[PDB]
């Protein structure tokens, strides 16, 4: 059935590889927040590099969202790319909000450039997200790793470039509206 309540978890790469494009990431997040202002649309901001942190715990309070955006605007990307840790912080909040009883969307902003065993960890954690009933989208930055993002997202139709033709914003907004009453 159609839904009105969505919880949107932004899982944002602040590793060194994306440092020169942090503005694109921030702008995407600000634009999607701007689009969805209802209190039944709750947002959470998570950042990750060599460790992950919840910048904005899940909330519909727009004052807190404004401050969360101020905090994201000052981020200084550096270090390694442990995307699995960012996904796990989204999963922990989803589990605490109700698990399969929730209406949960994860949007990962990343170049998908993963090292060593991180692909293994990331794919396992995204499979956990889906087991909790969440849907995973990936928005690719720079010369992003398309296949890696397709594996993390629910499918290739939930992967978009952050650059060009308003593809990512339109595609994700229209995907959410399709699920909406
Ligand atoms: Mg990186």
Q: Exposure of 76 by Cβ count < 10 A (0-12 exposed, 13-18 middle, 19+ buried)?
A: exposed
**Ligand 1 centroid vs 1 CA: distance in angstroms?**
38
Q: What is the DSSP string of 101-167?
A: GS-EEEEEEE-----TTHHHHHHHHHHHHHHTT-EEEEEE-SS--HHHHHHHSSSGGGEEESSSTTH
Could you give the CA distance from residue 70 to residue 162 in angstroms, rounded to a whole number?
20
DSSP state letter for 18: G
Q: How far is CA 57 from the centre of its chain?
A: 13
Report whether 44 belongs to an annotated binding site.
no
46, 11 Cβ separation under 8 angstroms: yes
Tokens coding 136: 């995973």
**Ligand 1 centroid vs 19 CA: distance in angstroms?**
9
Report whether 15 belongs to an annotated binding site.
yes
136 closest CA partner among 118, 159, 117: 159
Per the entry, the structure determination technique was: X-ray
Domain 1-181 class, CATH top level: alpha beta
């Amino acid at each position: 059935s159609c839904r009105r309540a969505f919880d949107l978890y932004f899982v944002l790469d602040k590793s060194g590889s994306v440092a020169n494009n942090w503005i694109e990431i921030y702008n995407f997040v600000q634009q999607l927040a701007e689009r969805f202002v209802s209190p039944e649309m709750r947002l959470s901001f998570i950042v990750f590099s060599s460790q992950a942190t919840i910048i904005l715990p899940l909330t519909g309070d727009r004052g807190k969202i404004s401050k969360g955006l101020e905090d994201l605007k000052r981020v200084s990307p550096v270090g390694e790319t442990y995307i699995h840790e960012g996904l796990k912080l989204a999963n922990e909040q989803i589990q605490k909000a109700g698990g399969l009883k929730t209406s949960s969307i994860i949007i990962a902003l990343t170049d998908g450039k993963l090292d060593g065993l991180v692909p293994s960890y990331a794919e396992k954690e995204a499979k956990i997200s889906r087991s909790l009933g969440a849907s995973v989208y990936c928005v690719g930055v720079l010369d992003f790793e398309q296949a890696q993002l397709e594996r993390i997202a629910d499918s290739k139709e939930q992967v978009f470039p952050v650059k060009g033709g308003f593809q990512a914003l339109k595609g994700i907004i229209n995907s959410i509206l399709a699920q909406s009453c």
